[PDB]
């Protein structure tokens, strides 16, 4: 079982980042062509602390991928029109077709994160959601979908630095939520305990160094895809 | 065993002239149930499967006759087409789910995965074999929230089914849309019975029950669909602390 | 070939209990029309607008009573909510369009853009004033293909409307629903008459006609909706080189 | 009126491409933030000859734009499930929300291009489609949408070269190459009838991919900025 206490947030990567980044981004383009020809859809989930580096990691991963074959979804907490359905319906509507890629910047795991800590979901709802989500991902992965989920983590000091830099780049609740970091760590740990499956693994990425985090996201995506290619008897 | 099987269904049961009274009463009760579900924002999902010409359409129509049509959709489900095969086989049904408080009726449904798709080989052995648990999990996530689900299997004898095939080709309203495949599948009825019984064994749950309806007498079948729907709605409401 | 106006409608017209005979006959003709539309893969779009409690729901229910529900959807349309305001105001209706061969009924519809949205200010002056032509173009794109469209405005007198408001507050199934909007709209009825008349002047087209229904007598209104629907389907079939046959 | 016969396919751009490209891509990022802040959607249409460079131009335009705010749709001819509706229905389903970006690699103009030439659409259908499409774009642009359409054109020899380079890394592409004169006629008629001030056509000579990409960027940004001015808004920094 994975827990945030096991991640070394001091891990760093130098300027060999340019080399590995180029190699891995072209490898990601190759993976896209493999997925398209074999009609296997790909689902990438990104969770983590605010400003942990989810957007930059996503962009580095899809930089060399053909945009005609992906959609990156920014997910917020359910709004009234979304609350007219079961909480997974919005995600079934956004599923990639076989062979396509869907990226979820935050995802259905909001059910056991912000909705749990803020009380949008009752104790019964979030407590049963682990098994419900395992079932959702299992129905998908028993067919022609691959699922992998990343949790990007940063220290409170690195997060504060990035908060300070973001308000100066003009391109609230977040400062309040920074105060609830221990609760989010506990909720994420329970999430790792109950939904880290061989068919849909969790990868914990220490994100203080953005370059290391981006390369790790790439490495884990490609390794998981490669394992699935081997398990299906296909050539990558 | 208390597993349901079609061989235990008494296809000789019938109903008389008390049909008009019971029918009008139960249809107005169904209107009442619709208003209750709307006020409490609980969606209702009714599944209809069975033999060809067993009476699904007539049962559905009698069930919704006094219900406000602004609050229901009846979906005629066929086998997955190429555009549907681009997704997991449950995606189309997640797209067709009612909003909380609305009613969705499925004339055939996701159980095609373990019925026609099994028998015709559209699904592989692994797919339909694992589909039972997948379907249980799907229905369980819905009913743990704000949906009520009940499923009906309408059955008729081979002789009654033949009589109804013949009556449909003589009806001007129906004779335009009757395929030879129904005549083809009459020969595969034993395989459908085995597949249906395994379905009943594995997916008849308290939160999503199967009701086996003897349909040779249409009046009996329609009254049973109404009664069982209303009784299940009341039981599930009670489990939520609500009273009709 | 004439401008319709609400002031030309005789709200005194009535129909006797000869309602049962014509009603059953017309409902079966509507089933036959459903079969014709499905066989020729022509979709049908029925719009209902009018005063609150003018009888839209009851008219819709009698129209589809003997129609197979696997081939229709009745949409209750309300004013756009935030999630709908993320798109052009017609996007939600394109998402609700019936497939070729199917029937879609709209209890209120896109004409809200020139009715409640105009009167309540949800739409700006420029928005509702340009909506007439926008809507004609929308309906023309649909009817030039394999769709038939017809639109009904149900009208009642203010006294009959008040009587029906009060009788619904005692309807065990109707009462529980909220009705504040209904009293708001009743207070603005003169403006609705003006707005609907401008609508009739600008969007009553041969490929998508407006039918003005005197609704004080519910039986008369139901028979008129059925008769006008079937007559329009017959004419449109003839224009397509097809024959609608009993 | 625009016609492909007036397009100079010899146009070129040299190594000043890298710097201009970087600047224009960052300007497109700024444009995305403006579009998002003001809740104005952007619709980019790409049509042209097979292998004219539409995909690469799209890729350079969105390279530095946040992918949480765009979708690029690869559009093919209507299939049976799409033929259950009016031909514009699929595209209304694909409209971006206010503030979002939607790119169409081929689009509703198939109605008057491939569908006209291959006979998927009858004479009546494709002949009335120009006005239908103008009305569609007009309802969108009178609200909170901006639309611009690009036609990418290449020479027959450059097209053959690119066909050979792709086959060394479908049949329909060779099918359309043989009917290229008819496609030129259809595109000219399209330009004549649907080049509107609110939804302009931009004809891009694509023999030099670098020039074509910079032109798509420049014309997109110029149209967005003009539209900002028309709405009383300032696209600056």
Automatic annotation (TrEMBL), chain A:
Coiled coil: none annotated. One of its GO terms (molecular function) is nucleotide binding. Residues 12-230 form the Polyphosphate kinase-2-related domain. Keywords: Kinase, Nucleotide-binding, Transferase. Succinate binds at residues 210, 214. InterPro entries: P-loop_NTPase, Polyphosphate_phosphotransfera, PPK2-related. DTMP binds at residues 106, 115. ADP binds at residues 76-77, 106, 115. SUPFAM superfamilies: P-loop containing nucleoside triphosphate hydrolases. It comes from the Bacteria. AMP binds at residues 164, 167, 172. It holds the Pfam family PPK2. This is Polyphosphate kinase. It comes from Lysinibacillus fusiformis.
């Amino acid at each position: 079982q994975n827990i945030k206490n096991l991640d070394l947030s001091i891990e760093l990567d130098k300027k060999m980042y340019k080399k590995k980044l180029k190699v891995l981004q072209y490898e990601m383009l190759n993976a896209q062509q493999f997925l398209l020809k074999n009609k296997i859809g790909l689902i990438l989930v990104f969770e983590g602390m605010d400003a942990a580096g989810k957007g930059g990691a996503i962009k580095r991963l899809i930089e060399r991928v053909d945009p005609r074959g992906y959609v990156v979804h920014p997910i917020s907490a359910p709004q009234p029109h979304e609350l007219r359905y079961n909480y997974l319906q919005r995600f079934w509507r956004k599923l990639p077709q076989h062979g396509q890629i869907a990226v979820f910047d935050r995802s259905w795991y909001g059910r056991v994160l912000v909705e749990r800590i803020e009380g949008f979901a009752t104790k019964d709802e979030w407590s049963r959601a682990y098994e419900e989500i395992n079932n959702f991902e299992k129905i998908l992965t028993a067919g022609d979908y691959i699922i992998i989920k990343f949790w990007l983590h940063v220290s409170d000091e690195e997060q504060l630095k990035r908060f300070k830099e973001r308000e100066q780049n003009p391109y609230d609740e977040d400062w309040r939520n920074r105060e609830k970091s221990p609760q989010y760590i506990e909720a994420a740990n329970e999430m790792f305990e109950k939904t880290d499956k061989k068919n849909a693994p969790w990868v914990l990425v220490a994100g203080n160094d953005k370059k290391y985090a981006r390369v790790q996201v790439l490495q884990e995506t490609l390794a998981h895809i490669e394992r699935e290619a081997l398990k299906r008897g296909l050539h990558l």
